[PDB]
């Protein structure tokens, strides 16, 4: 359920797609060298199932920095909540409970 984005072109496709389906998009901006970021992977992977009607994308900031500098993302991990092109809210850090919570409020 967690789709990793590997190119700027792939990113645009995923966003446009989810938009046509009027779905909620949750995005995890990661770093493989960042301890706090790895820890949140399972928590993100699990919530990926907890809500199938939302789209979960994984973006490595070392690979697609332009996407991070576009949404003002300077810390990792950072979870972004989007819908129809506009950001609705974001969670900064490995704050599990604040994640597992803000997801229900925007998804359901």
């Amino acid at each position: 359920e967690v789709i990793s984005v590997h190119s700027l072109e792939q990113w645009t496709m995923q966003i446009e797609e989810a938009n046509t389906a009027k779905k909620l998009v949750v995005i995890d901006f990661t770093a493989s060298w960042c301890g706090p970021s790895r820890i949140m992977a399972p928590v993100f992977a699990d919530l990926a199932k907890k809500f199938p009607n939302a789209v979960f994308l994984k973006v490595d900031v070392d690979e697609l920095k332009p996407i991070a500098e576009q949404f003002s993302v300077e810390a990792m991990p950072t979870f972004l909540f989007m819908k129809e092109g506009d950001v609705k809210d974001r969670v900064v850090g490995a704050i599990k409970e604040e994640l597992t919570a803000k997801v229900g409020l925007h998804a359901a």
Binding site: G35, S37, E74, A75, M76, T78, A94
Partner: protein
């Protein structure tokens, strides 16, 4: 080769957990070492700030590895560590650094004293010394690495005011000058 290499001071020697160092600017035309200072109407705790005078070394810090103390007591790159000032504080409390869990003035600052808004991990005080692309020998950047990874930079209001160390870009390039015991 597998383990992270040691961090080095301005004299080329390895950093030790039993010694003190000034955290100087690599480019002295951008200010001096780091110190403590109150800010934004606050009296306490003191904020970690940067002395604007390139001739000043600021206050010395003591660096301790976060996990188990290595037998060599050597400070290494990409390794969690704790940082605290070895200097007097008018707020008479802890001089150890921790990232401000709050967003004062719309900015995350590095502060000292007691942790007033703790986190489930107790890692607000975790930092790392790192290298970067195109970095000169003996030059480094500092990062918050507790519940996130973020570069530390310096907030400067050129209109006249204290300069504070916090989470922002671009990161502050520093060198470590061994301080007299």
């Amino acid at each position: 080769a597998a383990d992270p290499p040691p961090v080095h001071d301005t004299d080329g020697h390895e950093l030790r957990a039993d010694a003190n160092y000034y955290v100087l600017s690599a480019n002295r035309a951008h200010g001096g070492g780091l110190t403590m200072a109150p800010g934004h109407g606050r009296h306490c705790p003191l904020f970690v700030s940067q002395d604007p005078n390139g001739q000043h070394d600021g206050f010395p810090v003591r660096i301790t590895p976060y996990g188990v103390a290595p037998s060599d007591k050597i400070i290494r790159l990409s390794t969690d560590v704790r940082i605290s000032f070895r200097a007097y504080t008018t707020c008479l409390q802890s001089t150890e650094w921790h990232i401000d869990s709050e967003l004062a003035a719309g900015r995350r600052h590095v502060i000292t004293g007691p942790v007033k808004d703790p986190s489930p991990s107790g890692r607000e005080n975790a930092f790392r010394i790192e290298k970067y692309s195109g970095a000169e020998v003996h030059e480094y950047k500092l990062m918050s690495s507790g519940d996130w990874c973020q570069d530390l930079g310096v907030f400067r209001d050129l209109k006249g005011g204290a300069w504070f160390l916090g989470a922002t870009e671009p990161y502050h390039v520093v060198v470590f000058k061994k301080a007299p015991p």
